[PDB]
Amino acid sequence: VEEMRSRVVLGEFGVRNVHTTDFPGNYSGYDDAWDQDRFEKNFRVDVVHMDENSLEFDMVGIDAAIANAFRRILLAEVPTMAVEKVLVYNNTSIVQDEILAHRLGLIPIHADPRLFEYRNQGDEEGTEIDTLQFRLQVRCTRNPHAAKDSSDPNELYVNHKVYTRHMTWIPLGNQADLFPEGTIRPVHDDILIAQLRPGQEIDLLMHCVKGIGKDHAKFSPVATASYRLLPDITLLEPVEGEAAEELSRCFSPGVIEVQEVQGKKVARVANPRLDTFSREIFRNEKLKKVVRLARVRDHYIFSVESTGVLPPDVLVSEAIKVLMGKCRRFLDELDAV
Amino acid sequence: GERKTALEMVQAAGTDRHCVTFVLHEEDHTLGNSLRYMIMKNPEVEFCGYTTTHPSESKINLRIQTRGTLPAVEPFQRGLNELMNVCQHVLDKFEASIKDYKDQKASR
């Protein structure tokens, strides 16, 4: 007669169970029929960090299926713009043509994909509606004003290294209005595309189309969008007297804060969230009996890091909206019968 | 609208309305698993399970077997609605939290 409703207990030789006991018929009384108000009451989002290119909200009180749906949407279904075709007029570089096209596909563009649309199948030409064109034209020459020196930038250098700065947007249609001068640009100005020696030249036109990270990774808008369940650490016994420090070393260092309540030293669990699961207490043989570390049941921690095309919060919003769009597409196709 | 990027339903042996297999095209484990989680909350369904037919293909099979009365197409169309309601609520809550944090940080 003992219920544990909220944690995923764990030892070393394996974890105890894979359930969450929050579904219909999963208890004598604790049965579920998807009370929507109970959800709307027990759900809360807490946004910890939000630099540019980072977010770490909490998303407390949701199941693993919905959290995983959100994570898989950001990685593979939120749309981005990226180079699909490369027209090479001349290329006397050491970097091949196919390898140059590949390298150009993996460069992130700062166009927002919500103002564009998908190219129809076999729309090779493209129009202001679905495409953005950029041009890289660079040639390397020796600089006339150079002494007998060997630094590659000083001599043998007008364009020794071709960067993303060298790529220039060719406004395709009326896109010069709508897009102000600096808005459509590659996100990073320092990505090394190639290297040149005097007499070598690159000249090409790149076409960027819309697409999702599912049919090619180049179109994916986040470095990673993973999540982790909130750890839980409980001191079953008061640790003290120089075993507190050994305890504080078997964890990521901020988790167990050793206070000094009396002349003796007491270890306390200051911040369970910092913990990385390393299970190094389980090697102690005397303190594996003192601490129980498990996971909180439906308390997640998310971390979204965008490449630079869209801000992270906008990414999460568009992910939730893409899931809603899936649901609505299937609802309206069902209503079609 | 789309004759086959979307739904194809196969009523079972005897065309039992209470046992249907929906084929959802262009879907992977994301919608499959979230929709199966949302359809399991209905006390009127006795068996819900999804599965991907083959890696090379892009389509899932849901199987809903409901109790004696309802035609097993209401559980599906209600799991869809509840999942979309949950997404709308999560979106509202997340945007409100982001706004509140932006204000708290821009003030200080």
Partner: peptide
């Protein structure tokens, strides 16, 4: 580290 203060 710790949701917003």
């Amino acid at each position: 580290g710790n949701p917003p203060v």
